[PDB]
Design a protein around this ligand. Structure first.
Ligand SMILES: C[C@H]1C[C@@H](N2C(=N)N[C@](C)(c3cccc(Nc4cnc(C5CC5)nc4)c3Cl)CC2=O)CCO1
Length: 332
């Protein structure tokens, strides 16, 4: 009975962090993406006979004594970048870091449509968002874990470290060996994504955003950072792709601007060596244009590669005594 426990995260060859999850009895091992930009739990099953599903640990429900199916024909389909996932719904017992989660609803990947799944070794998703993005089931996975493990405090934090393979997901609390200084908490505006109000956004000395209401989403399943299309045009007029090598990377980016996010009295800065990534012989901005249609108010994503590699993020679920908050600190 470990009230504070650690689930080690392994950065795969691509742009996602996966951890160990046991599904069923006797347990079957899968390595799903731990996602805070969605809520549903997906697991890749043996009913999927495509090569994209092969060469990856597949979960067989016919070998689980605790797997139960229902007669309601609730079929799930979610878009997943270039591909899409389609499957049925069921319930089984899960185990995440020596903690049992019984009678949990999850999606069973039965068809993988398009080569993205073959590249990333897709084995499932474990959503950690708020209820309301749950497509099927009565209770989300993380909510059910806290219910069946009352001693665990309703919070988890991500320590992202892809360079050395020491990334980890800590559930139930925080450790000073993953961050330095003090954590600044931000209130969560709307309980769909892990969303936070954004007051101002500065590219160098120029104010580019927050004429209208804008928000920040902390998505551990999105590698890059994002801005709306309107601000992304201004972003690239000031920030350009340049040729660089591993030896001259620091001197070339010495002239580049500092990106400042304003959260009330808190200011978060992304230095050029922190938001510029080296691919082949060019340094490119780790930023994307995604227009989030969930809320007409356009929002900004803080991802795993650029933001979380340098900042320790804390996801505090609200209870009857505290509201839901996101806390950020400098990574150690
Ligand atoms: C408002 C947010 C919601 C986000 N969002 C998720 N966070 N979850 C889902 C399941 C998701 C969709 C697509 C990709 C990924 N993840 C992933 C990343 N990168 C690579 C490497 C190959 C390039 N493969 C996979 C994921 Cl997790 C659904 C989804 O829309 C997307 C950005 O807007």
């Amino acid at each position: 009975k470990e009230n504070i426990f650690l689930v080690p995260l392994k950065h795969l060859r691509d742009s996602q962090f996966v951890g160990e999850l046991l599904v069923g009895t006797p347990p079957q091992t899968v390595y799903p993406i731990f996602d805070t930009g969605s809520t549903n739990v997906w697991v890749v099953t043996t009913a999927c006979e495509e090569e994209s599903c092969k060469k990856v640990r597949r979960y067989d429900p016919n070998k689980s004594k605790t797997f139960r199916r229902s007669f309601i024909e609730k079929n799930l389909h979610i878009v997943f970048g270039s591909g899409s996932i389609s499957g049925s719904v069921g319930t089984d017992t899960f185990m995440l870091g020596k903690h049992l989660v019984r009678n949990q609803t999850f999606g069973l990947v039965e068809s993988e449509s398009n080569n993205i799944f073959d590249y990333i070794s897709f084995e499932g998703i474990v959503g950690l968002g708020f209820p309301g993005m749950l497509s099927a089931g009565n209770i989300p996975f993380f909510d059910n874990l806290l219910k069946q493990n009352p001693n665990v405090d309703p919070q988890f934090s991500f320590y992202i470290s892809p360079y050395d393979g020491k990334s980890t997901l800590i559930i139930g609390g925080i450790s000073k060996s993953f961050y330095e200084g003090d954590i600044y908490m931000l209130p969560v505006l709307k309980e769909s994504y892990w969303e936070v109000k954004l007051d101002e956004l500065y590219i160098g000395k120029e104010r580019i955003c927050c004429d209208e209401e804008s928000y920040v989403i902390f998505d551990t399943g999105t590698s890059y950072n994002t801005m709306p299309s309107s601000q992304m045009k201004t972003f690239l007029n000031l920030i350009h792709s340049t040729a660089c090598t591993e030896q001259n990377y620091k001197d070339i980016l010495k002239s580049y601007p500092i990106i400042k996010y304003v959260f009330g009295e808190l200011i978060i800065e992304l230095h050029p060596e922190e938001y510029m990534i080296l691919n082949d012989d060019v340094c490119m901005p780790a930023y994307m244009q995604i227009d989030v249609p969930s809320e007409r108010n356009h929002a900004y994503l803080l991802g795993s590669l650029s933001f979380m590699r340098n900042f320790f993020t804390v996801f505090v679920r609200g209870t009857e005594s505290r509201p839901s908050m996101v806390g950020v600190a400098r990574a150690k």
